[PDB]
Write a protein that binds this ligand. Structure first.
Ligand SMILES: c1nc(N2CCC2)c2nc[nH]c2n1
Ligand SMILES: c1nc(N2CCC2)c2nc[nH]c2n1
Ligand SMILES: [Cl-]
Ligand SMILES: [Mg+2]
Ligand SMILES: [Mg+2]
Ligand SMILES: [Mg+2]
Ligand SMILES: [Mg+2]
Lengths: 194, 194
């Protein structure tokens, strides 16, 4: 019933562009929307985000998150490890690569989502959510070395899975960080389960 | 360590703007970023709300109430938590309850309200509160709920059992071209992982 008629370029940067989208509303009336897109899409999606389950015997299972300065937010955010998918890279490979560069951990793929949208009222941006386990008892994950690319500066924060929502709430209250909505949604569901 | 030095307007729409952000990196070097923001944020603690609406009814499994709508930035249909922007002077809770009623017809009761969480912090400053609301589906008000769409709003309600949400979403994606929202998928994955 609804569909895109045309897209008008408004402004194109190196990384991001803004378009004016014309679309048919379901009454047969023509309407416009201000839409954001990345200029980098090739890929199944723009990016990947990794849900990294750190498994160490005799410890609680942890979810590994990252903290970085985010210029659009003007502050520090707590997020799943994540990055854009390289041209000709599979989402699974992007997931292990980004996880290693951002955290130093070497993980194994558990499952991979379909492309999912980030903020569909605003942008066309999509990601694959890739669940990865990390065997924290393996020697390669003993002293995990983060490999920050040029212009990346990432702190690693591992939080127990069974208390994740309360641990995040505490970080927000004391550290004045912004938690990512996907991470928050994951944490809420861990509490809402059963 | 890191902070914003300047924000230069590149292009300003009715709803969305694009900025060149200058910031200080942690080595002490000046760098730039292309940043998206909405034009509609005033004194609100966030741009919008998304609602996690848990439909509860005697002798029924709990359901998660979702909405399906055409999203012009995506060029197609998306499955999302009910959501909208917070009106000026409106609380996030009030906005949640109001958007849930407008989009679904249901009258919920507040359960919890998140701090402001970021939508896509490598791209935009956009933030929401995630508001958990229970719906008493035994109450007569919630028997035959009718959405009250705004001008240009055309929303379908999809209620899925919490106990099988991820599979039910996968089955929806298998049957039509539609995209699931990343917060919905994250919530569904944690329900499985718990
Ligand atoms: C048109 N209307 C929008 N509104 C949000 C409430 C109506 C919008 N948001 C991002 N781009 C947009 N273009
Ligand atoms: C600068 N660099 C960006 N990226 C480095 C990897 C994507 C970017 N993304 C949105 N805006 C941006 N401005
Ligand atoms: Cl898992
Ligand atoms: Mg990253
Ligand atoms: Mg990177
Ligand atoms: Mg809405
Ligand atoms: Mg609405």
């Amino acid at each position: 019933k609804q569909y895109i008629i045309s897209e008008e370029l408004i402004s194109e940067g190196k990384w991001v562009k803004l378009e004016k989208t014309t679309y048919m509303d379901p009454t047969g009336k023509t309407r416009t929307w201000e839409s954001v897109k990345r200029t980098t899409r090739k890929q199944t999606a723009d990016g990947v985000a990794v849900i990294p389950v750190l498994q160490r015997t005799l410890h609680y299972e942890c979810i590994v998150l990252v903290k970085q300065f985010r210029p659009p937010m003007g502050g520090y955010c707590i997020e799943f490890p994540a990055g854009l998918i390289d041209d000709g890279e599979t989402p699974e490979a992007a997931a292990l690569r980004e996880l290693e560069e951002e955290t130093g951990y070497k993980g194994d793929i558990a499952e991979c989502s379909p492309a999912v949208c980030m903020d569909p009222g605003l942008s066309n941006c999509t990601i694959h959510i890739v669940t990865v386990t990390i065997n924290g008892d393996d020697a390669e994950n003993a002293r995990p070395k983060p490999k920050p690319g040029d212009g990346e500066f990432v702190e690693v924060i591992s939080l127990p899975k069974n208390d994740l929502l309360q641990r995040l709430d505490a970080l927000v209250a004391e550290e004045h960080l912004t938690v990512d909505a996907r991470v928050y949604s994951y944490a809420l569901a861990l509490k809402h389960a059963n």
